[PDB]
Design an enzyme around this catalytic site. Structure first.
Site, PDB file in Angstrom:
ATOM      1  N   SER A   1     -20.773  -0.319  29.771  1.00 44.84           N
ATOM      2  CA  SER A   1     -20.400  -1.613  30.329  1.00 44.84           C
ATOM      3  C   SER A   1     -21.011  -2.800  29.564  1.00 44.84           C
ATOM      4  CB  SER A   1     -20.752  -1.701  31.810  1.00 44.84           C
ATOM      5  OG  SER A   1     -22.136  -1.569  31.999  1.00 44.84           O
TER       6      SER A   1
ATOM      7  N   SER B   1     -26.169  -3.064  33.591  1.00 37.59           N
ATOM      8  CA  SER B   1     -27.406  -2.833  32.880  1.00 37.59           C
ATOM      9  C   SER B   1     -28.349  -3.911  33.376  1.00 37.59           C
ATOM     10  CB  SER B   1     -27.119  -3.047  31.402  1.00 37.59           C
ATOM     11  OG  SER B   1     -25.768  -2.732  31.099  1.00 37.59           O
TER      12      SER B   1
END
Ligand SMILES: [Mg+2]
Ligand SMILES: [Mg+2]
Ligand SMILES: [Mg+2]
Ligand SMILES: [Mg+2]
Ligand SMILES: [Mg+2]
Ligand SMILES: [Mg+2]
Ligand SMILES: [Mg+2]
Ligand SMILES: [Mg+2]
Ligand SMILES: [Mg+2]
Ligand SMILES: [Mg+2]
Ligand SMILES: [Mg+2]
Ligand SMILES: [Mg+2]
Ligand SMILES: [Mg+2]
Lengths: 248, 244, 242, 232, 196, 244, 196, 221, 204
Positions: H129, H169
């Site tokens: 991502s 993240s």
């Protein structure tokens, strides 16, 4: 077409299993190897038997790493050994490491080898293996250990022993010398003596193969950063390290 | 011990496989057959013994074709020979299906080689009772091979096998020496007829029919064809006059 | 004794079928030898063509296994070819799976393990052959590895196989005792071939025309065989030192 | 003497396959049957064998398609396997390719089928011989199959006990019969004569004689009983 | 679904199980027994998809019978229920799952207790003082939660049940044609002669 | 084919015995003796090791006594390696019963299956029987303490006390004379050792040449405990029987 | 992607763009879509990357083995092998491949294997999403037996246009030149080809 | 998840964030995503985290074995080939996306591998991502002939892009450095910018605060 | 329709100083319908504890299965399995069913008997090791557990304080989940001993 679905090892009227006996005879004819167990280590050792002086004997490993903490050596038919080593390394992964994420302890890996050996003693269309192995290792819950595995599939643990030609002599010689306070350096010293009787050719680091199961070697790990992974306990000695010790 | 000769994959103590050796006897015992490499093709010929006048002439054809460009002929156990060709045909079809190009003759030799050698590996099977002479025209020219029950094969200038093999071999050795420059296809056909007639004299007792085929770049177009009619007659003539 | 007919133990602990397979290796009466240069490996083999009807160009006991590996076989051709094909297949499959060219010593190991199996299983017979693999390995340098019907294998500084193997071997042992090194100290493979033929003529006591030999050469990233002509060149060079 | 006859995968030191040779011996012990052809017809004639005076005469002729069939001599069940295997190949040729199967090819298929049993452990070879007749795209045909695998195309022949008689007669009769074109009955009478140089101590009845014929404008058909009185 | 109830009193286990079998639009029968005796002191009632229910029960039955003969011994109700659960749990990841729910009531001769086990078609097993399958719980658990005492007699158990069946007759859209009732006690298994 | 090499391991002699079983039993007669004795309040298992060097590691050794389960153990006589195969499949049978039924497996049930396995090697598939005899000691709650034996034929039988391996005729006799049913466990311990003292072919009977084990419902709680004696515990028990 | 191969007098040239997209994101802007399966037989890959890499890896394997045994394979043989994989596995592959190589007997040869696994031998071939935009230009500008420099230009211009218009094509233009001489790799960057 | 790989002149370095999430929930704030395939070949994964573990363990094992057979240091290209052939076989159902980097005797290497079995080679790579944030940084700063210390700084900055700007993240930055000469260096939590502040309060309870019905001692023994 | 949400239930485990704790609700449900309040979801194999939430048939099956395997393990290694190793076992056993898995969320707790370390771990339904020193959660109220835990937890709690914390974390989470509750049990584990407590809670 494998027609041979029947055993080739059968009971004789006296109760012997000839083919296991004969395998043992092949072993007896093999070159001497031995192993001995200290308190802080184990050593296994054998004689390199150069078939030509044109052969490169370094390219023949008679002593093999099975797992980072477990090694082996043999007397008998080397090819049968080579494929048992391949097989044993694989079974250590498939039937242990791939399940529990750690390498098998010494005795369990020995069972697995033993088992393979037994199968060749009973299955269709095969002969038994013509070797005896000495396997040495360490694991956290059993410590240091030393096992002997025979063509029959039987194994047994030892404080020290020897197999192959000079083995009756050498087993005698080891009984005199073995105590339970032996430190690893001392056991190496003894291994070298006990071998030296059984050999009349040149005797030095090029004609002798020798490994130890000792302290962990972080210099041989290949990476740094995980304080919980310390090196392999197994280590072959160098041609040098051996001669070094041939002073004492 | 004894009986090293009862089982097929077994080495005798001198290093040999007696069942393969016995299969060679079945071959030595067959009729004569030969191959001649000319310098753009190859020629096969074979003695067909005439048991009886009740055989239909022309019609018990012993040379077999593989793919379009390969001829095989064999001396010995005939059904084994046919079995071997059936295999050869699967092999050539598989090779061609995958690689497009018709199978190269050396490639095809090794296919038979491996399959024959395979029948010397196991005791549950019996070695082939034939020597096979075969070849054709590939993209590198002509090739002639001969293949023994053991799976030994090599390339030849000429080759023979069966009862007549020694008179034929001697006769072929002539041709090699008395035509170092190469032999034309049409001359190789006639010579082949001669050589079969010469090798027939081991058992004149029996009457025989001659059969010849050729694979030649110029004459048949790199395809395998039987020789018949006028050209067959002309080569039988050359064989009669070369007897007297 | 059927302990003589199949690969099971005699009462002495012996596999007679293995012993008898060794014996078969000598049926061709061909000797072969291999040696190592600074950055090449050479194999030499006699070449006999008893029959005048054979196409000589088809008569060979040397095989190009891969781009890099050469194999020479001591023993009967059907078994040689069976082992050749097998090794070709193995070397190619190894490349496909692991992304690099199969090394000499590893291929030798594999082929040896296959032999080992025929010594342990009963319906399989050992092959009557001895394979000598050569290459210039990218990790190991010029290398020679030999396999037999026992399932045995080892690496060699140089080696020789056949009936007169002993003569040739002792000749080479002697040479290296003097020279103090494990290779022919030569840059060019054309001279390592010359050395090899020379040290062979002296051991067999016999002279060679260009049709009496086969040669194979392994350089870094190619193994090739010579033609009668590139051989002839070598025999002329040898003759210039009488 | 003769460890070499224990199975089919064993060659003798002279180069022979004893098990096959022993299968050929079952044929000679079988009852005689004769085959012959002109350019327009082919004919089987067969001597059937009974067990008692109370028993049937074992049939020896089997139809394989409209244009083809055979007679047997030797192990009968084995003929049943082979004739059945053949019926299938004749059938497969019709269904897939819409083509009457050629006698030459049926020849080759039987050879290849028999050969299998003579190279493999466990298989005994077939213990029967066969005469096959057919009329196909190249006219009349007669074949002789042996369980070795050899099939050979002939104008005439015979197999089974005392068949050497019928065969010698056919060799001499040849040019008479080879020209019995467009005449079914003559060719049969010439087959029945042949089969007689082969009877020892019994002659042809309505119960023991069977005959089959095939050819141009005549499908493979079998006569026995009343139907055969005609020619006896 | 049909009606599958059970209750474990002090000295026995009572199973009540609807009599109707209906195929779409008609009620095909009004006297069907949704139980099999698995061994003399072990009773299984069941409900779920057609065919599957019976096939499954009769298969469990034959297996327990086989066991008894072989060992000349009767498995404990706990063991039977673990066996049954495991079979159902294999069914769910199978090509065609058995859609069957069961109750197992047994008297355990070795411990001299009655035991009730509820197991659904997924292999979800649980030991309970009273249970039911499908919607049957929704009407009756209110009443059991209230009235149940572990020391109830068989007669009390049967009264408490009578009340449960009345609640079902009143509030439940389906006519399940009454129930058959069985009792599993130290002397085995018997059927209550009439639930009038 | 290969039926020449097949020594047919599953056939009857003309007396109706099974050659290979008889021969395996012969083999077993030369194994270390093993003994099982059942008291009303426990079981004893005792066995003699094959003469073992002074350098052998006796702490970690387990040549003859094996745990199948928390409640069942076996003493082996014969081929160790063959036995460990069998032991292990049995440990799994126990686990399967436990997982199916949530009840520990009754001793006979286990014994029967393992004996059924050996029986199969005796009736099909041309392999050699397992060269093992077994003494099984276990507790279940259907029959309390139990002792059984099985051999290569597949036969099993139950016992109050029993021996396998070397000198069983001798050892059986001596137990027969001294066993009584009220017997307590420490009585059985003593009897087990007397018997091996007399029975051993070795001139002494010392701690380093024994393996030893008990199964006690003792002491306070109804649960069952399995104890495999270590070298030091066995030495103590030998002093305490004044056999040393 | 945009890819082509073109035969010329001295042999044959293959070219391609170097862009790999997952939707609108450019996963890799310096892809090598020119892939060697033998010394002088190469291919151009279009379609699924996984599929074409995996196929190419297998063909290479087959030709390595062919070579070991029968010597150097024909460009036609290599196209046969690609075709056989593509035709026989059409139901689970998305691969559009151009094969090109050189030998002395035949000089340059180009075969194209579009989806479905039909095979087609041609003087030149184009493929990938970008190809649609240059059918006109190429049919109009290709001539047989061009020189090397002419042919490098024909390619450079054809692909500069395919890139210009197709969003799924871009980056550098790679070529591989195949002749008796050997094997030449070429690269051309944006600042060169955009400006044409 | 953000993972990257950057070559430098004497080797190669990879890096990864330490967050792992199930939907919008963070299940682990300090997950280590840097996996060893063999001592000098490391791996970072994104996708199904059970698939990336499983497939790095499995190939790690086949590699070790193959290494023991061949008596040779294991090569990256072997890890690559074995991975891809397995992913391809499973048609993308094994949701493993990896950046694998390492040094072997043929030099230093950097590859990525997609779940369906395609592979890329490059000098710098990212995945997950956080992939696009990281790549923006690499596209901005990468130059040829980076020193080691520049490559770490760069790879570390790239992951930071992912941490801050991506919700998938991260937390901390892990790094492994593989230099051609040396032991591989693995720097767990090389960077930890994300420490929780002390809470306003302690939530330790007064003992006896909780209602209880039964105590049992439990049997280990 | 979602197998992880039919029967409901939760499990949470956390570490303290020289101890670990692990706890579950007791509810077996079948959607809206409460079925049992005596469905413990915590099992143990020697000194290793395993909590399992998710589809109950599978909870049961997995337990039966790990009992089986840890049995065979003890018999061969001649020693009880440790938590680090069990974890790997659980993980590999679940991934065997990768394309048809068990619908569960396991949690491991225990103290390594050699090293003395507290250890805990969790996994998805196909077996990725979610490893964390502080705490692990699983079940139909995993969100609410994450919330309680992140606020309540502080490291190095003494056993009697850890109990108070994990108990509160569990109860207040189950009370915001429809499909958990109906009772609760908590194990406190120290190296040499283990105490198990049932909690008083609401029953609705
Ligand atoms: Mg290293
Ligand atoms: Mg006779
Ligand atoms: Mg299951
Ligand atoms: Mg489900
Ligand atoms: Mg078994
Ligand atoms: Mg069971
Ligand atoms: Mg496309
Ligand atoms: Mg494919
Ligand atoms: Mg495209
Ligand atoms: Mg992790
Ligand atoms: Mg299981
Ligand atoms: Mg054990
Ligand atoms: Mg699966």
């Amino acid at each position: 077409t494998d027609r041979y679905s029947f055993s080739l090892t059968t009971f004789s009227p006296s109760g012997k299993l000839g083919q296991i006996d004969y395998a043992l005879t092949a072993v007896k004819q093999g070159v001497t190897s031995l192993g001995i167990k200290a308190t802080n280590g184990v050593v296994i050792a054998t004689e390199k038997k150069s078939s030509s002086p044109l052969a490169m004997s370094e390219t023949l490993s008679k002593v093999s790493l099975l797992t980072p903490d477990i090694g082996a050596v043999y007397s008998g038919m080397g090819p049968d050994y080579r494929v048992l080593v391949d097989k044993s390394r694989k079974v250590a992964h498939t039937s242990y490491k791939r399940i529990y994420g750690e390498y098998p302890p010494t005795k369990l890996l020995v069972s697995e080898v033993a088992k393979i050996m037994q199968e060749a003693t009973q299955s269709g269309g095969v002969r038994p293996f013509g070797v005896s192995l000495l396997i040495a290792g360490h694991d956290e819950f059993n410590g240091f250990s030393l096992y002997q595995v025979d063509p029959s599939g039987s194994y047994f643990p030892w404080k020290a022993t020897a197999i192959g030609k000079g083995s009756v002599a050498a087993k005698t010689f080891l009984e005199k010398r073995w105590n339970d306070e032996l430190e690893l350096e001392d056991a190496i010293h003894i291994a070298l003596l006990t071998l030296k009787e059984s050999v009349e050719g040149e005797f030095n680091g090029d004609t002798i193969e020798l490994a130890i199961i000792g302290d962990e070697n972080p210099d041989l790990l290949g990476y740094t950063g995980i304080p919980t992974d310390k090196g392999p306990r197994f280590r072959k000695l160098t041609s040098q390290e051996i001669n070094d010790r041939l002073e004492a | 011990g004894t009986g090293y000769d009862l089982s097929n994959s077994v080495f005798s103590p001198d290093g040999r496989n007696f069942q393969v050796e016995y299969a060679v006897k079945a071959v030595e015992n067959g009729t004569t057959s030969i191959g001649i490499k000319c310098n753009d093709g190859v020629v096969f010929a074979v003695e067909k013994l005439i048991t009886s006048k009740l055989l239909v002439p022309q019609k018990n054809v012993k040379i077999q074709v593989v793919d379009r460009h390969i001829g095989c002929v064999y001396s010995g156990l005939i059904p084994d020979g046919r079995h071997l060709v059936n295999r050869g045909r699967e092999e050539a079809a598989s090779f061609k299906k995958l690689y497009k190009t018709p199978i190269p003759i050396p490639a095809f030799a090794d296919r038979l080689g491996q399959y024959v050698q395979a029948h010397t590996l196991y005791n549950s099977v019996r070695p082939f009772g034939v020597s096979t002479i075969f070849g054709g025209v590939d993209k590198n020219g002509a090739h002639l091979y001969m293949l023994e029950p053991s799976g030994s094969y090599w390339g030849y200038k000429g080759a023979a096998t069966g009862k007549g093999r020694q008179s034929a071999k001697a006769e072929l050795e002539k041709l090699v020496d008395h035509h170092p420059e190469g032999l034309s296809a049409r001359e190789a056909v006639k010579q082949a007829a001669k050589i079969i007639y010469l090798a027939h004299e081991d058992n004149k007792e029996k009457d025989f029919e001659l059969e010849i085929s050729w694979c030649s770049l110029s004459e048949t177009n790199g395809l395998h064809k039987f020789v018949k009619g006028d050209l067959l007659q002309e080569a039988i003539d050359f064989a009669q006059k070369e007897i007297n | 004794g059927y302990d003589r007919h199949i690969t099971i133990f005699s009462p002495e602990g012996r596999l007679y079928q293995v012993e008898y397979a060794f014996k078969a290796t000598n049926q061709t009466n061909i000797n072969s030898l291999a040696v190592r240069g600074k950055d090449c490996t050479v194999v030499i083999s006699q070449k006999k063509v008893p029959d005048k009807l054979l196409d000589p160009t088809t008569v060979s006991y040397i095989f190009c296994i891969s781009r890099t590996i050469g194999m020479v076989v001591n023993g009967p051709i059907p078994d040689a070819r069976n082992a050749a094909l097998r090794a070709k297949a193995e070397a190619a499959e190894f490349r496909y799976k692991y992304g690099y060219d199969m090394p000499c010593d590893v291929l030798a190991k594999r082929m040896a393990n296959l032999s080992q199996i025929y010594t342990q299983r009963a319906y399989m017979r050992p092959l009557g052959v001895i394979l000598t693999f050569v290459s210039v390995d990218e990790e190991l340098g010029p290398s020679i590895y030999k396999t037999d019907p026992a399932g045995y294998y080892v690496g060699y500084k140089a080696t020789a196989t056949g009936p007169k193997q002993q003569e040739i071997t002792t000749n080479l042992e002697n040479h290296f005792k003097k020279s103090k090194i494990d290779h022919i100290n030569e840059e060019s493979w054309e001279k390592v071939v010359e050395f090899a033929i020379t040290h062979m003529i002296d051991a067999l006591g016999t002279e060679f025309s260009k049709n009496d030999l086969e040669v194979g050469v392994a350089t870094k990233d190619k193994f090739f065989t010579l033609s009668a002509e590139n051989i002839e060149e070598r025999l002329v060079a040898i003759a210039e030192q009488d | 003497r003769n460890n070499y006859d224990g199975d089919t995968v064993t060659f003798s030191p002279t180069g022979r396959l004893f098990q096959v040779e022993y299968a050929l011996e079952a044929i000679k012990q079988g009852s005689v049957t004769v085959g012959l052809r002109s350019n327009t017809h082919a004919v089987l004639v067969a001597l059937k064998r009974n067990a008692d005076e109370l028993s049937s005469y074992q049939k020896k002729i089997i139809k394989c398609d409209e244009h083809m069939g055979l007679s047997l001599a030797g192990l009968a069940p084995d003929a049943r396997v082979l004739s059945n295997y053949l019926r299938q190949q004749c059938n497969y040729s019709s269904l897939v390719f819409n083509r009457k199967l050629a006698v030459e090819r049926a020849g080759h298929l039987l050879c290849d089928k028999a050969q299998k049993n003579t190279q493999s452990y466990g298989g005994r070879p077939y213990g029967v011989g066969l005469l096959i007749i057919g009329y196909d795209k190249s006219g009349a045909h007669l074949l002789e199959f042996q369980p070795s695998g050899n099939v050979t195309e002939l104008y005439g022949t015979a197999i089974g006990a005392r068949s050497q008689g019928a065969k010698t007669y056919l060799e001499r009769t040849l040019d008479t019969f080879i020209k019995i074109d467009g005449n079914p009955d003559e060719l049969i009478k010439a087959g029945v004569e042949a089969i007689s140089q082969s009877l020892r101590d019994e002659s042809l009845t309505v119960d023991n004689l069977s005959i089959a014929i095939v050819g141009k404008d005549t499908p493979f058909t079998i006569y026995d009983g009343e139907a055969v009185a005609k020619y006896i | 679904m049909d009606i599958i109830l059970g209750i474990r009193v002090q000295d026995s286990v009572i199973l009540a199980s609807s009599k109707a079998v209906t195929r779409g639009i008609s009620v095909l029968k009004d006297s069907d027994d949704k139980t099999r005796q698995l061994s003399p002191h072990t009773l299984m009632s069941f409900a779920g998809e057609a065919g599957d229910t019976v096939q499954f029960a009769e298969y469990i039955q034959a297996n327990i019978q086989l066991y008894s003969i072989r060992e000349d011994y009767e498995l404990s109700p706990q063991a039977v229920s673990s066996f049954v659960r495991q079979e159902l749990a294999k069914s769910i990841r199978s090509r065609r799952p058995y859609q069957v729910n069961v109750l197992i009531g047994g008297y355990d001769k070795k411990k001299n207790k009655p035991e009730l086990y509820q197991i659904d078609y997924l292999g979800t097993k649980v030991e309970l003082p009273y249970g039911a399958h499908g919607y049957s719980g929704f009407y009756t658990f209110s009443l059991l939660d209230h009235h149940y005492r572990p020391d109830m007699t068989t007669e009390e158990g049967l009264d408490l049940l009578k009340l449960c069946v009345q609640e079902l007759e009143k509030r439940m859209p389906m006519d399940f044609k009454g129930v058959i009732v069985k009792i599993v006690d130290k002397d085995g298994i018997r059927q209550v002669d009439d639930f009038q | 084919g290969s039926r020449r090499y097949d020594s047919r391991t599953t056939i009857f002699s003309p007396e109706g015995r099974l050659y290979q079983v008889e021969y395996a039993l012969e083999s077993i007669s030369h194994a270390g003796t093993a003994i099982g004795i059942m008291a009303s309040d426990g079981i004893v298992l005792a066995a003699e090791r094959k003469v073992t060097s002074t350098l052998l590691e006796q702490d970690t050794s387990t040549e003859k006594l094996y745990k199948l389960n928390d409640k069942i153990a076996v003493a082996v006589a014969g081929l160790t390696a063959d036995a460990e195969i069998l032991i292990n499949t049995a440990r799994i049978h126990a686990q399967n019963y436990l997982k199916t039924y949530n009840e520990d497996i009754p001793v006979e049930i286990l014994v029967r299956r393992l004996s059924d396995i050996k029986q199969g090697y005796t009736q099909h598939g041309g392999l050699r029987p397992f060269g093992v005899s077994f003494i099984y000691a276990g507790y279940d709650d259907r029959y309390g303490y139990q002792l059984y034996t099985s051999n290569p034929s597949g036969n099993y039988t139950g016992w109050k006390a029993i021996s396998v391996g070397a000198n069983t005729s001798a050892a059986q006799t001596l137990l027969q004379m001294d066993y009584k049913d009220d017997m307590k466990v420490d009585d059985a311990i003593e009897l087990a050792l007397k018997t091996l003292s007399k029975t051993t072919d070795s001139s002494a009977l010392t701690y380093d040449r024994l393996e030893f084990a008990t199964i006690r419902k003792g002491a306070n709680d109804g649960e069952v405990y399995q104890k495999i004696f270590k070298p030091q515990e066995i030495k103590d028990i030998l002093v305490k029987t004044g056999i040393t | 992607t945009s890819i082509m191969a073109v035969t010329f007098k001295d042999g044959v040239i293959l070219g391609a763009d170097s862009r790999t997209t997952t939707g609108a994101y450019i996963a890799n802007r310096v892809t090598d879509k020119l892939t060697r399966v033998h010394d002088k037989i190469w291919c151009c890959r279009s379609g699924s990357a996984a599929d074409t890499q995996a196929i190419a890896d297998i063909v290479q394997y087959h030709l390595e083995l062919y070579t070991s045994q029968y010597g150097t394979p024909s460009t036609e043989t290599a196209a046969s092998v690609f075709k056989e994989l593509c035709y026989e596995n059409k139901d689970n592959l998305t691969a559009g491949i151009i094969v090109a190589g050189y030998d002395d007997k035949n000089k340059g040869e180009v075969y194209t294997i579009p989806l479905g696994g039909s095979v087609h031998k041609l003087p030149y071939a184009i493929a990938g999403s970008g190809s649609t935009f240059i059918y006109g230009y190429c049919d109009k500008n290709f001539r047989e037996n061009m020189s090397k420099e002419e042919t490098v230009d024909f390619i450079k211009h054809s692909l500069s246009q395919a890139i210009k218009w197709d969003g799924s094509s871009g980056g550098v233009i790679r070529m591989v030149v195949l002749t008796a001489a050997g094997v030449e790799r070429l690269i051309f960057y944006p600042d060169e080809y955009e400006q044409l | 998840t953000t993972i990257v790989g950057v070559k430098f002149n004497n080797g190669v370095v990879i890096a990864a964030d330490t967050r792992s999430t199930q939907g919008p929930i963070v299940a682990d704030k300090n997950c280590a995503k840097l996996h060893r395939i063999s001592p000098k070949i490391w791996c970072a994964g994104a996708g199904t985290a059970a698939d990336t573990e499983a497939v790095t363990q499995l190939i790690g094992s086949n590699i070790e074995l193959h290494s023991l057979y061949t008596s040779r240091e294991p090569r990256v290209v072997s890890a690559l080939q074995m991975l891809k052939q397995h992913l391809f076989k499973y048609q993308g159902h094994i949701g493993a996306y990896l950046i694998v980097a390492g040094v072997d005797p043929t030099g230093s290497h950097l590859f990525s591998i997609h779940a369906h079995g395609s592979t890329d080679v490059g000098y710098y790579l990212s995945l997950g991502s956080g992939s696009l944030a990281a790549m923006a940084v690499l596209e901005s700063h990468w130059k040829q002939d980076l020193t080691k210390e520049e490559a770490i700084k760069l790879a570390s900055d790239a992951i930071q892009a992912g941490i801050w700007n991506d919700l998938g993240s991260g937390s901390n930055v892990d790094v492994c450095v593989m230099e051609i000469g040396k032991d591989a260096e693995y720097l767990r939590n090389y960077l930890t910018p994300n420490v929780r502040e002390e809470k306003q309060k302690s939530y330790k309870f007064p003992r006896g605060t909780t209602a209880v019905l039964k105590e049992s001692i439990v049997n280990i023994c | 329709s979602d197998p992880s949400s039919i029967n409901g239930g939760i499990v949470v485990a956390m570490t303290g100083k020289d101890c670990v704790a692990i706890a579950c609700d007791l509810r077996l449900g079948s959607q809206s319908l409460g079925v049992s309040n005596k469905f413990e979801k915590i099992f143990h194999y020697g000194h290793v504890f395993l909590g399992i939430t998710g589809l109950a048939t599978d909870v049961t099956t997995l337990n039966e299965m790990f009992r089986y395997k840890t049995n065979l393990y003890k018999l061969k290694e001649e020693r009880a399995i440790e938590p680090e190793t069990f974890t790997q076992l659980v993980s590999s056993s679940l991934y065997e069913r990768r394309f048809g898995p068990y619908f569960v969320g396991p949690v491991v707790a225990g103290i390594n008997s050699k090293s003395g370390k507290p250890f805990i771990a969790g996994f998805d339904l196909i077996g990725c090791i979610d490893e964390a020193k502080d705490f692990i959660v699983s079940g139909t109220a995993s969100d609410q557990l994450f919330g309680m835990c992140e606020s309540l937890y502080e490291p190095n709690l003494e056993p009697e304080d850890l109990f108070e914390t994990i108990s509160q974390a569990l109860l207040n989470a189950a009370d915001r989940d429809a499909l958990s509750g109906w009772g609760a049990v908590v194990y406190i584990i120290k190296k040499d001993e283990v105490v198990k407590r049932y909690l008083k809670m609401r029953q609705d």
